Amino acid sequence: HCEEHLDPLSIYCEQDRTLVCGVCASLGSHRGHRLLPAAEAQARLKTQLPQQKMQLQEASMRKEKTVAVLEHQLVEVEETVRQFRGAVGEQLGKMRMFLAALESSLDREAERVRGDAGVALRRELSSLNSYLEQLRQMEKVLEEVADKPQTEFLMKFCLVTSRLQKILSESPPPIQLPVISDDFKFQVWKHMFRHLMPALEELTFDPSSAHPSLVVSSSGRRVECSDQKAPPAGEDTRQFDKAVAVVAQQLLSQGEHYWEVEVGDKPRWALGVMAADASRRGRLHAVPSQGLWLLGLRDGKILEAHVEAKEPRALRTPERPPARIGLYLSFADGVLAFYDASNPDVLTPIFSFHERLPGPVYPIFDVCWHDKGKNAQPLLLV
Amino acid sequence: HCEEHLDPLSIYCEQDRTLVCGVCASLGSHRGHRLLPAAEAQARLKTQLPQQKMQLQEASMRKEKTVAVLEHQLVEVEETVRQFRGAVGEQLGKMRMFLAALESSLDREAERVRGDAGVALRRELSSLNSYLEQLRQMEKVLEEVADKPQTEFLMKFCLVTSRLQKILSESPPPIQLPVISDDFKFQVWKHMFRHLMPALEELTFDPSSAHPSLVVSSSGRRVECSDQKAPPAGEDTRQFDKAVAVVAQQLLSQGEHYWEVEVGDKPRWALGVMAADASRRGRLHAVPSQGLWLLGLRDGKILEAHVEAKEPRALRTPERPPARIGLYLSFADGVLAFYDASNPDVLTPIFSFHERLPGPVYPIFDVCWHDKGKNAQPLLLV
Ligand SMILES: [Zn+2]
Ligand SMILES: [Zn+2]
């Protein structure tokens, strides 16, 4: 084991990790190193077995945990991708099925209209064929009895004249046709925008946080005003004392929601959202610092937005005041957008919000003064 | 034939158009019925046989005309309904296929991102599996060979420790893709609106209708402005001699067309259309009496629409001046609509018209004065 001394190696050296023999351990690479009796070295390196064992166990457990974490990340990426697939598929199939259903319904309606028109015009065709047959019969009777004996002619003259006069009073005078248009692109685009809104969140009013000026009925969907006094309020933060406003029964914190409100003949009103952690009683201002976001319309032509400032902002309204407004709320983007829902098939934008939200929020509605007699117009909520 | 006068009928009675006898017309049923004899009256009132024949022929011809009208109405309504069915179905299947294409493109993008993340995480997983195999091998070798004879045990202890120290050189570092949103549908809607416009009619310019003050080149596809003296013009009705304007070679009168134009750095310019059945030469204004609709930009930030009035309507201008505008022309609805084409994938409406449908129209484009030195800004055309 030595190649130099014609004798093998028999002594190990730990601090140089090298095997040697007596001659090499006498002159050269080793004389007094961490040589071994095997006894001192065995005891000294075996006493520290649990240290290395514990380090190995630490490394093994840590790397197993790392493997599990990475596998969990892989699974979570798979879940995210699959959820993305499903959500995109549903949100595009909504429009796909809407367009397909509309096309199929219109095609079936056109087929039914074609059948009805064919039936009517075939009835008219049968009537006209009968009329032509009667005319030919009368002509042949005339040409056959015009040269009969005098007695038969004098017997039949009046009769034939009366028959002609009677049969000359059964005849239909015949523009009554179905219509088509070229604005299909714009109408389909706008109606698709309309039908892409989420479901109408069925909101009902909440009287526990309302002012006793307005009155609510119709299964919590209708609210109007009266002309009678309300007893005074007490001491409670959740009761509205300054503004004549109300919030809804529902409390939304995640997802997507949308609802249309028809105001009808009421000239002055306002809508918006209010944070649940905000003040309901006491002096209140149109400040989002109090968690209130508002948008109001008065006089039928004066629209105003109360953004966070000491000044409202007006907008142009058409000569005919629209009476139905749709609100869309998204908690993900935190966007509350307004659209003109007075047209049942087309919406026109009005206003929108883009902020961060405390969460959650109540949809708040505020009526203007009762006008003392004439503001009995109802307020609906779909 | 009388039961009272023992005589048959021999006298005609005009007020009753009936043959009677004399006695009843003397003391009875025809006291004053203005009697007639029967032979002369029979022949004289019989003279109108060809009259009845001609009336019967007239009625037959009128009802035959009615039959022809009904048949033509049936066939033409059927053809109109079938053509509308086919056109609407195909032009909505167009949107269906567009939605499918967008969904497939997004699916391919998601698949590519998932594949890249999976490749990275699988490389890391394979590395960690190899590391775990090494750890298990080391642990099992130690716990199985820890009880060998002392010579081999002390020979292998150091080796194993050094192997652990060598393999203790692997520090573990311990993917990014978008998720669904609520404006995802709206963005898809906007891209659908952008890409749903009809095909870009590949129209080229006609140099026979340009003023030689500014320069036109590239086979009638490029036109820009210089600051140079202009040679005098010639004689042509379709060629602008007073104003530095140009029209297109093609002349279209039915259907739907759309095109985007980039204006770049030029601050003042104007575009529009001119009716072909109107006056063509001389200085012309945006008057539908001459079938002219215009739209201009000045000061680089002041956009204006030239509707039919004695004033260029000063539309509201955005904070960012757009440098690419798309124009859509529909002859059916007679609509000239403007859109913001600065976004290469989404267009936003600006204005529209609903007016006279003269037919056909020349697309007219007018550049302002060369300003003699500073109006060297180019004019692009996409
Ligand atoms: Zn030796
Ligand atoms: Zn008689």
Numbering used by the authors:
A (entry chain B), B (entry chain A): 85 to 258, 263 to 470
Publication passage describing the model:
Here we present the structure of Mus musculus TRIM72, a complete model of a TRIM E3 ubiquitin ligase. TRIM72 is a member of the class IV TRIM proteins, which is the largest subtype among the 11 groups of TRIM proteins.
To obtain a high-resolution model, numerous constructs were generated, purified and crystallized; however, most of them diffracted poorly. Therefore, we conclude that the RING domain is highly flexible in both the TRIM72 dimer and oligomer on the phospholipid membrane.
